[PDB]
Amino acid sequence: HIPVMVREVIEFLKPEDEKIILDCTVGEGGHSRAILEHCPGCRIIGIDVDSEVLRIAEEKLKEFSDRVSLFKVSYREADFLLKTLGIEKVDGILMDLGVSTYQLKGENRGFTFEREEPLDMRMDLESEVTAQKVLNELPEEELARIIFEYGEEKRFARRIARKIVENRPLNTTLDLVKAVREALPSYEIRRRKRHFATKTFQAIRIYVNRELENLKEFLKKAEDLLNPGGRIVVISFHSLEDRIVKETFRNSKKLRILTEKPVRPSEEEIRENPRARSGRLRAAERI
Template identity: 50%
Template sequence: MTATDVPAHEPVMPAEVISMLMPSRGGHYVDCTVGLGGHSALILNSGADALIGLDRDEDALRIAAERLAAFGDRVELVHSDYRQLATVLDDRSVSGVDGVLADLGVSSMQLDAEGRGFSFRRDEPLDMRMDRTQGPTAADLLMDVEEEDLANVIFQFGEERHSRRIARAIVQQVSVDRIETTGALAAIVRRAVPTRGYQRIDPATRTFQALRIWVNRELEGLDTFLTDASRRLLTGARLVVITFHSLEDRIVKHTFRAIAAASEAWQVLTRKPMLPGDEEVARNPRARSAKLRAIERLA
């Protein structure tokens, strides 16, 4: 895929990200979730001297590399999980940076690209891994999950009230045969969920979200990552995090509070999260559930 094949991509809460990170001061920044490079381009265009961009998805990095090529050696892209941030910076002898951004979750490219297995709108292999070089696929994980554990995943990560029925139906199916495709999984979920009247969203939506978070262990180690990132901030620098899920937002809120409570060197800048404006949500529906929180290193 080339950059020109990618649907126009608009980064979420661009003005808020820039006002919080203040790249106009120059300096070195880290974009921990470079994705399609939207925020990275903004940060570089707004004055940052250099940026390290991480992503665990090699396809995303290829697209970002094309988008950011014009910035030359001001950008370094690294295939890495952001939970390895400390190692990535140590390997480059970078002890402190002028700002860190993490725009968590899945990208529009991952949801829309063919063959990734994130979407129930197409029938394709049930993969769902952001990093296809590592770890089991969704189809693999479903092969030996306990029904109760699966119900908890679907309930917690998908906020799906029919989680028990869905888990039972999935486990029954895998006892007979592997669920190989997104289409097969969606059909099982749709059959398991009682339908009454008009459905605002596809009944498979919440289960697919839950399985994606589970497959990619999206919440594991998020607190440690935030703490590591906050320690790499130079004086006056900020860590800005955008979440799209209440569980993620809760972890960010509590971790930021704990960091600031443990030392006066850090201050939480967002007692309440910043939200996208109505105009942005109308233009970019993906921004709908975004919440932005930020912490600053004072000393």
């Protein structure tokens, strides 16, 4: 995986001198490595809920092991993790939402619709709920709500939910693709820019990982973890996600928005990492 919009992350996070940075979604360690290379005196507390990517990050960040520490914990519990480390506040907070390319291409958890894999989609394999259980057992009306809300399928959510039910029991990513294909007319599939199953897969993933609920709850209080002048930078890839960030930054009384308009990748930043496409970066400062 290649770090998305690393230049803008560094620009807004302002890692310098001996700042302490909380990387809420360390993943394979891409952004963290860039920060450590850019700032020799900084310290990073990196967290993720996926132990498999933390293994990757620990090896990738080897050369900086004395200045970065990794932990398996949800950012919703970052406040107490910091306390157990003797840290009350940090100078920077970074969040890169979504899925790591390794999670997409190498974990065999069915995050992707491109190859046949089990319907798992858990970022934390220790959690109980799987995409398979959700798809095979949730009431049809709830599936419709999820696809409409998290998938943003504003016209076909009910029909996609109906096809999922008609295709039960589902077992692989290809079974889900089949359900979505049967729900969308040929002209609609062709009309779309991204693969037609993209939104439905996203909706199930977000539900399984409580991605929007976690983000909303964390961002409400994130400001309390920042030292004066501290920076919080978030990269979203979902309109509903970006809206939550935008709104949270706006409604905060302790944060001064630094990006009225979302910072987007340059056509070139897109090449250096096609994952950057759909990426919207927002930043704010503790005042």
